[PDB]
Write a protein that holds these residues in place. Structure first.
Motif, PDB file in Angstrom:
ATOM      1  N   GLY A 142       0.834  -1.184   0.000  1.00 32.06           N
ATOM      2  CA  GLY A 142       0.000   0.000   0.000  1.00 32.06           C
ATOM      3  C   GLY A 142       0.870   1.235   0.000  1.00 32.06           C
ATOM      4  O   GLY A 142       1.827   1.327  -0.755  1.00 32.06           O
ATOM      5  N   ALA A 143       0.553   2.192   0.853  1.00 31.92           N
ATOM      6  CA  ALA A 143       1.302   3.440   0.856  1.00 31.92           C
ATOM      7  C   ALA A 143       2.440   3.445   1.855  1.00 31.92           C
ATOM      8  O   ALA A 143       3.150   4.453   1.966  1.00 31.92           O
ATOM      9  CB  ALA A 143       0.377   4.609   1.173  1.00 31.92           C
ATOM     10  N   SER A 144       2.620   2.363   2.586  1.00 33.63           N
ATOM     11  CA  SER A 144       3.533   2.336   3.711  1.00 33.63           C
ATOM     12  C   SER A 144       4.495   1.175   3.548  1.00 33.63           C
ATOM     13  O   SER A 144       4.190   0.193   2.856  1.00 33.63           O
ATOM     14  CB  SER A 144       2.756   2.194   5.021  1.00 33.63           C
ATOM     15  N   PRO A 145       5.672   1.267   4.161  1.00 32.71           N
ATOM     16  CA  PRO A 145       6.652   0.182   4.107  1.00 32.71           C
ATOM     17  C   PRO A 145       6.049  -1.189   4.389  1.00 32.71           C
ATOM     18  O   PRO A 145       5.328  -1.377   5.356  1.00 32.71           O
ATOM     19  CB  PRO A 145       7.645   0.593   5.195  1.00 32.71           C
ATOM     20  N   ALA A 146       6.331  -2.154   3.518  1.00 31.38           N
ATOM     21  CA  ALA A 146       5.939  -3.525   3.815  1.00 31.38           C
ATOM     22  C   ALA A 146       6.726  -4.025   5.021  1.00 31.38           C
ATOM     23  O   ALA A 146       7.942  -3.893   5.054  1.00 31.38           O
ATOM     24  CB  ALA A 146       6.216  -4.433   2.625  1.00 31.38           C
ATOM     25  N   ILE A 147       6.030  -4.578   6.003  1.00 28.95           N
ATOM     26  CA  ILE A 147       6.658  -5.308   7.095  1.00 28.95           C
ATOM     27  C   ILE A 147       6.758  -6.739   6.614  1.00 28.95           C
ATOM     28  O   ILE A 147       5.739  -7.365   6.299  1.00 28.95           O
ATOM     29  CB  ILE A 147       5.837  -5.199   8.382  1.00 28.95           C
ATOM     30  N   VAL A 148       7.985  -7.216   6.454  1.00 28.81           N
ATOM     31  CA  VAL A 148       8.215  -8.534   5.911  1.00 28.81           C
ATOM     32  C   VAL A 148       7.898  -9.485   7.049  1.00 28.81           C
ATOM     33  O   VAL A 148       8.552  -9.421   8.093  1.00 28.81           O
ATOM     34  CB  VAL A 148       9.657  -8.671   5.391  1.00 28.81           C
ATOM     35  N   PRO A 149       6.932 -10.377   6.906  1.00 27.26           N
ATOM     36  CA  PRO A 149       6.679 -11.355   7.972  1.00 27.26           C
ATOM     37  C   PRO A 149       7.912 -12.169   8.311  1.00 27.26           C
ATOM     38  O   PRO A 149       8.701 -12.547   7.440  1.00 27.26           O
ATOM     39  CB  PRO A 149       5.586 -12.247   7.386  1.00 27.26           C
ATOM     40  N   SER A 150       8.063 -12.471   9.591  1.00 21.64           N
ATOM     41  CA  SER A 150       9.243 -13.230  10.013  1.00 21.64           C
ATOM     42  C   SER A 150       9.291 -14.606   9.363  1.00 21.64           C
ATOM     43  O   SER A 150      10.375 -15.159   9.181  1.00 21.64           O
ATOM     44  CB  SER A 150       9.267 -13.342  11.542  1.00 21.64           C
ATOM     45  N   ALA A 151       8.143 -15.167   8.979  1.00 26.25           N
ATOM     46  CA  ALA A 151       8.167 -16.470   8.322  1.00 26.25           C
ATOM     47  C   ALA A 151       8.973 -16.412   7.033  1.00 26.25           C
ATOM     48  O   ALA A 151       9.668 -17.370   6.676  1.00 26.25           O
ATOM     49  CB  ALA A 151       6.739 -16.931   8.023  1.00 26.25           C
ATOM     50  N   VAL A 152       8.859 -15.296   6.311  1.00 25.88           N
ATOM     51  CA  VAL A 152       9.639 -15.076   5.109  1.00 25.88           C
ATOM     52  C   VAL A 152      11.121 -15.061   5.428  1.00 25.88           C
ATOM     53  O   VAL A 152      11.919 -15.698   4.732  1.00 25.88           O
ATOM     54  CB  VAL A 152       9.208 -13.774   4.432  1.00 25.88           C
ATOM     55  N   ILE A 153      11.506 -14.274   6.447  1.00 30.65           N
ATOM     56  CA  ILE A 153      12.898 -14.167   6.854  1.00 30.65           C
ATOM     57  C   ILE A 153      13.403 -15.529   7.272  1.00 30.65           C
ATOM     58  O   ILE A 153      14.508 -15.929   6.920  1.00 30.65           O
ATOM     59  CB  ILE A 153      13.071 -13.147   8.001  1.00 30.65           C
ATOM     60  N   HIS A 154      12.595 -16.269   8.016  1.00 25.76           N
ATOM     61  CA  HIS A 154      13.048 -17.563   8.492  1.00 25.76           C
ATOM     62  C   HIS A 154      13.444 -18.464   7.326  1.00 25.76           C
ATOM     63  O   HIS A 154      14.420 -19.212   7.417  1.00 25.76           O
ATOM     64  CB  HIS A 154      11.964 -18.205   9.355  1.00 25.76           C
ATOM     65  N   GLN A 155      12.739 -18.362   6.192  1.00 27.59           N
ATOM     66  CA  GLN A 155      13.064 -19.219   5.064  1.00 27.59           C
ATOM     67  C   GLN A 155      14.413 -18.890   4.468  1.00 27.59           C
ATOM     68  O   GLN A 155      14.966 -19.714   3.742  1.00 27.59           O
ATOM     69  CB  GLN A 155      12.004 -19.124   3.961  1.00 27.59           C
ATOM     70  N   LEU A 156      14.956 -17.715   4.750  1.00 26.58           N
ATOM     71  CA  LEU A 156      16.293 -17.421   4.270  1.00 26.58           C
ATOM     72  C   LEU A 156      17.348 -18.207   5.043  1.00 26.58           C
ATOM     73  O   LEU A 156      18.414 -18.486   4.496  1.00 26.58           O
ATOM     74  CB  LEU A 156      16.568 -15.929   4.375  1.00 26.58           C
ATOM     75  N   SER A 157      17.065 -18.575   6.296  1.00 25.00           N
ATOM     76  CA  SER A 157      18.016 -19.330   7.151  1.00 25.00           C
ATOM     77  C   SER A 157      17.499 -20.715   7.532  1.00 25.00           C
ATOM     78  O   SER A 157      16.967 -21.457   6.690  1.00 25.00           O
ATOM     79  CB  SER A 157      18.303 -18.573   8.444  1.00 25.00           C
TER      80      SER A 157
END
Length: 135
Positions: free
Chosen positions: A82-97
């Motif tokens: 939308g008009a504001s910074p996306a808050i990346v869900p931690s589940a997404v981040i977790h998949q990086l590690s």
DNA sequence: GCGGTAGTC
């Protein structure tokens, strides 16, 4: 609270943005991926940015203002929901590690050899996962 | 949009 965001960096200024952000006590993340590419007509292994020119950052928006991040040397802009910074869900981040869309979205990402396609995949996956957290 | 770790720009 600490949340994760996704920034785009100015052309060739990523290491610079990482510098200035870390100086401000913002955790930075620019994952690499090792894969087989062609170099001088020979298949070889390379390490390259998973999502070229993108940088995951983690900070508390009540401590450090997004306007401050949006004015950090090297930074081009936030990925927005939308008009504001996306808050990346931690589940997404977790998949990086973990989510199913997340899991499969990254299965596709990790097998996509072109970085720009990987980023497009990433943006779509973040959009979908955020929408999924809405009521 | 730039230059900015903003902006009585």
């Amino acid at each position: 609270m600490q949340s994760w965001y996704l920034l785009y960096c100015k052309r060739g200024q990523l290491q610079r943005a990482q510098e200035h952000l870390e100086r401000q006590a913002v955790n930075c993340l620019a994952p690499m991926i090792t894969l087989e590419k062609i170099v001088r007509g020979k298949r070889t292994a390379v390490s390259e940015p998973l999502f070229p020119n993108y940088l995951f950052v983690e900070f508390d928006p009540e401590v450090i203002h997004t306007t401050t991040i949006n004015a950090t040397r090297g930074v081009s802009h936030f990925v927005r929901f939308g008009a504001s910074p996306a808050i990346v869900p931690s589940a997404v981040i977790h998949q990086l590690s973990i989510t199913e869309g997340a899991f499969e979205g990254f299965q596709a990402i990790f097998t996509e050899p072109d970085g720009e396609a990987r980023s497009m995949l990433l943006l779509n996956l973040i959009n979908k996962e955020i929408k999924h957290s809405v009521k």
